[PDB]
Write a protein that binds this ligand. Sequence first.
Ligand SMILES: *[C@H]1O[C@H](CO)[C@@H](O)[C@H](O)[C@@H]1O
Ligand SMILES: *[C@H]1O[C@H](CO)[C@@H](O)[C@H](O)[C@@H]1O
Ligand SMILES: *[C@H]1O[C@H](CO)[C@@H](O)[C@H](O)[C@@H]1O
Ligand SMILES: *[C@H]1O[C@H](CO)[C@@H](O)[C@H](O)[C@@H]1O
Lengths: 116, 12, 248, 172, 152, 173
Amino acid sequence: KTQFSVGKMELENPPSILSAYKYDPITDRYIYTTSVDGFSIDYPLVLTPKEYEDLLLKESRRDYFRKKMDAIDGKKTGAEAAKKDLLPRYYINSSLFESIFGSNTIDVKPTGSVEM
Amino acid sequence: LEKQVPTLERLN
Amino acid sequence: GKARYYDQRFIPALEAFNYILYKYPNSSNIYTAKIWREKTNMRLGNDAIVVKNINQLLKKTDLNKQTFSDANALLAEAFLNLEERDSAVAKLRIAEQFSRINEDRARYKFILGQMYQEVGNKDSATYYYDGVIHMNRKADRKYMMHAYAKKAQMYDYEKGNDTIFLKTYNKLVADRENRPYYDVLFYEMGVFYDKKKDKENALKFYNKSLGRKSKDPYLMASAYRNIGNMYFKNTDYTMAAKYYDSTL
Amino acid sequence: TTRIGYIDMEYILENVSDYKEAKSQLELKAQKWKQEIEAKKLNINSLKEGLKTEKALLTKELIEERETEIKFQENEMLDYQQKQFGADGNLMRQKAALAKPIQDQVFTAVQDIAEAKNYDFIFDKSSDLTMLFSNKRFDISDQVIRILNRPAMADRQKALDERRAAREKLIE
Amino acid sequence: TTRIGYIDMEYILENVSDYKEAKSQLELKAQKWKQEIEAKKLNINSLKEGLKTEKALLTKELIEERETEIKFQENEMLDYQQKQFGADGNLMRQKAALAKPIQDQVFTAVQDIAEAKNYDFIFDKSSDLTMLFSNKRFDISDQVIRILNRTD
Amino acid sequence: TTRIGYIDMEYILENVSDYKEAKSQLELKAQKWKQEIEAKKLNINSLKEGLKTEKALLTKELIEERETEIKFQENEMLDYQQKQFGADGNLMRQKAALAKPIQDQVFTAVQDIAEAKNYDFIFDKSSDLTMLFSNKRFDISDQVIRILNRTDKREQLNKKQLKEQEAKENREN
Ligand SMILES: *[C@H]1O[C@H](CO)[C@@H](O)[C@H](O)[C@@H]1O
Ligand SMILES: *[C@H]1O[C@H](CO)[C@@H](O)[C@H](O)[C@@H]1O
Ligand SMILES: *[C@H]1O[C@H](CO)[C@@H](O)[C@H](O)[C@@H]1O
Ligand SMILES: *[C@H]1O[C@H](CO)[C@@H](O)[C@H](O)[C@@H]1O
């Protein structure tokens, strides 16, 4: 035994609970709101430009890296589509690899008769 | 008119 | 990278070109990779960076004539995106001068004529349209026919000679090799007769252009709208309404 | 003496049916709450329309009393919404209750593998911290999934030896 | 040869000071502010409905002043919301004043421990999403707590 | 034992000149868009003032047409503002797409560095706050920056240099 310090895993919000950023041009702000049907579930988070921009850039960089390595790995149910935009250095696909013959099937068959 | 026909129907 | 670029997938194309520039220093395609990276950046909306890098590369490279023309065409496109008409004109002039492909040369001369016509310099626009005409069968006939159309657009209606214009465009429109562009010519002739206050001939040539079945929707719409305007200005509002319904 | 592995919890949870079942149950509960809130909204709108249809007939005291009743109903709706979908209650609790069994199974498998392979830390590749490089032999996602769902010459020589042993044993 | 430790920021924060009670009070105040915002939204909606009900009886001039009053109320609610819940101010400023001195002290103590004991990496386990499992033997939070408690 | 390296993506993006220049150009484009929005606002205000000045001399129908035109202009301005500066507008999308080629180059360089030097893990230190203290000995950000500058300022070898390189690399056989 090593007495691990266990973290946690949690479910995400159901699709009926929207969570989005809205741009208010009256005050030129970006407000993050998590609402089910217009009712703010938590406190709204209003940020300035260059405050929303930094977080958006950080999350976009993280998502880009995550999608790239998900495509590289391949076992994520959607990486096959993203493998096209990958550098071929990072993966090998068998659709363009062939054996000495195109398949392993044998189909040479005889027809006719033989008499003794 | 059609908004006040119901209260016309409503009585007592 | 080239296949991704022509598939309009610019981020992976840039990745391929950057990998060429990163992994193969001893390659002989370094300059081609640099130019292709720059045009990919231009497609991504980085025209200032493109101008800077291409100017840096062209400073001391003495590269091949065709790649020099390609780099200058890229510079012209980047300057167009930056809204610098003079720089774009100069770069496109160099690209057309150093180009070896006849189709590209005709396209560049046509675009130079278009630029000068947009600015209003009818002398230089006429020069470049005539240069396209002088390339008679070395390029697609669309460039020559539309150069004739744009030369008709820049006609001088105050001092110009109507007889020479009419004879030239009648010779053009009575030619078998010009059939796929008859509409484009016919419309122009109608416009000419529209601006000389000759409603009969203008209507006749607009009808010819319409009967040519342009297959370009805006040419058909323009002919219908021009006939509608001719009828509207003649206090004939029923036919004007009919032709407006036609162009809608 | 300090080994680090990674889990990639997204891929692991993609291979657990209980995760999809829990997501469906959470969606069903959310839909039930939304339907109840919609019923309350319908009642409040009916009250508002009833007040509107007589706003030009009765005196100010009755109008004010009905408006206070409508405000009380709206406050009751707000309290119900804060109780159901709010920051603490009936959604956080439901999410925790639904995720507790899946967390138990997944973390039991991960702990078993970590103790077996003597890992000191087990990071998550799908978390906010991004690893641009991973050694790919410290990835224990496949072993966790298997637990939850339950030198060519040397290889050739081993295969030949196994074939010989199997053929010898089968006939006798 | 690579030495790795970790800390639990929440555990240290709760141990060194009364962080939990102040955080709960701040959460209650934030919930009160959110409910006030919802009440303002309800009042604005009621005013809009009342204006919509009475339009024929108006001269389009009192309609204009009622619309300006509604817009003023909406802007007042919006600026109140920005002031209370902005990325800097009255919630983030209060949370910062609550947790910033202790966070800086913990950072300084962590740097001192890392320099003294030649640590290579010190990870923060407080997120609980990354760092799913930790050996708890490479845990230096009691040292951080004792260093913090040494200072008055 | 495991060898851990890390980069700082914000630091790398700060030490790339082309990225900074592109960001400045994007800010200039955003300023131009804001000026266009201001021009639209000025036109809308002029229309509103014109309607208000002569509102008594117009019939109900004409007032309705002028008000509909003003509403159409206001809706067009709102649509332009949301399309250019929205949460997923042109400005934000173009800002997010600036670093993608740099991210590709950084990823490739990190793979190559981790292959060269026996690194088991390479983290992005700026992705989250998990990495509290990181020894600067394991920061490969400056190496990545050197690689990025090297590929940015690449130069084609001359014919003599190419022949020398071929002779050198062909010496194994
Ligand atoms: C491009 O070039 C033109 C003339 O060559 C300049 O006027 C312009 O400012 C830009 O540098
Ligand atoms: C374009 O070209 C014409 C003929 O070369 C000039 O006259 C004109 O000024 C412009 O440079
Ligand atoms: C063009 O010029 C000819 C003579 O050159 C005229 O006959 C004609 O009417 C038009 O003016
Ligand atoms: C509009 O009107 C013109 C008038 O001839 C028609 O040709 C056209 O088909 C459309 O009805």
